[model samples]
Target chain A: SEALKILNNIRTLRAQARESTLETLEEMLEKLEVVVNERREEESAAAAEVEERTRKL
Target chain B: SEALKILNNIRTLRAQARESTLETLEEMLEKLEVVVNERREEESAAAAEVEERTRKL
Candidate 1:
């Protein structure tokens, strides 16, 4: 659900940025940075678990 | 224009991928990965540029 929301937000931001409105682009980039940061953090947290699960295979 | 180009390409790729066509998703993901990599490189370059610009202020 969280990933879906992030993906949707990214899509929305990309759409607004496509309009070539500087304000929209700025706002979108700000939101994008936040989402990206969140993803990075999530990835970091999950990496160890992912590796452990893979080793069990 | 560069960002717009990338964004447009991503939209095109997503549409193709959404079609559920195996061939389309494969091709589109290949293209999408290239764009994503390019974006990461560009962001790295821009960050260095910003640091340089700010240090002069």
Candidate 2:
């Protein structure tokens, strides 16, 4: 019974650990995407500013 | 002797699994940073283009 209990415990913990790691990685991916999108917005804003100034001249 | 073998095997495998997980996470972090840097460059390039065009006008 001890062996069975130990085996089950190991399996459960390993699965949980793997899931946690996956969730963390996914969170990181989301944060990276957010930053990328923000950069794109900044680029667009800069372009718009240039368009406005050049158009005036 | 069987219990000893089982215990040792469990310990070894768990350690290996943990190390592998850590390595994978580190690789993911590096890739995210690379993407973030690329985004930064894109933003900078846009700003530089705006500067060049407006200055000539």
Candidate 3:
């Protein structure tokens, strides 16, 4: 059936796109976690410094 | 063919999972953008305040 073959081909293409998108998103998430954690640490330190200086006045 | 039927079913399942995962990721991205932008604004304001206070001393 030509229609069935066409549907199968579209499914294959969708799967390919889905797989690639998932892989890229996973990589992005890994990097985001590292950056977010670092930002948390940096922000806390900066906040502490501000508080300390403010108290000194 | 039984084999073809099984394969088709598996494909359908995979496509369903892919669709759901993509949807959740999209929603997550939307929220992440909002939070991230807010954080950028907040971090800059906090940094500026720290600098201004430091200079006043």
Candidate 4:
């Protein structure tokens, strides 16, 4: 899915960021954390039931 | 320099998207956030000895 591909791109981009300078690493990481936390929270709230459905199949 | 360049590109792309539209900003930020967090977590996990090499550099 597109969502998974975007997620993987994010992963690769982050790895690149880490190999850069520390200042850039810190700034980018903080912003990234906020997004990840928000999405996880949203998914947990709205999609919890979907997981239950998937497990039965 | 290559690593640093990619990191900067990611940052620039993010800022451009942020200025483009509120919706794109939200979505891009969410994905960017995951990459940043994962890299930081991985770096921190190896911090003990890794700190010394960087300090001398």
Best by DockQ: 2
TM-score of chain B of 4: 0.45
What is the overall TM-score of model 4 with all chains considered together?
0.30
C-alpha DockQ of every model? 0.03, 0.10, 0.06, 0.06
Candidate 3 per-residue lDDT, tens place, B1-57, comes to 222222222334335445655333233322232333344455666777667545654
- Fnat for every candidate: 0.00, 0.19, 0.01, 0.09
As for candidate 4, its clashing pairs are A32-B33
DockQ-superior candidate, 2 or 3: 2
Any residue pairs clashing in model 3, and if so which?
A: none
Looking at candidate 3, what is the lDDT of residue A16? Answer: 47
* CA lDDT, candidate 4, residue A38: 46
How many backbone clashes does every candidate have? 0, 0, 0, 1
Residue B53 CA displacement from its true place in model 1, Å: 50
- Cα lDDT of model 2 by residue, A1-57, tens digit: 222222222334335546564333333433443454466457556666656645654
In candidate 1, which residue pairs clash? none
Off by over 4 Å in 1: A1-20, A53-57, B1-57
Q: What is model 1's C-alpha RMSD?
A: 14.0
Local distance difference test values of all predictions, in order: 0.38, 0.43, 0.39, 0.41
Interface RMSD for each of the candidates: 11.5, 19.1, 17.3, 12.9
Cα deviation at B10, candidate 3, in Å, is 24
Over A9-43, each residue of candidate 1 has an lDDT whose tens digit, in order, gives 33454454445433332333323334334433444
lDDT of 2 at A57: 42
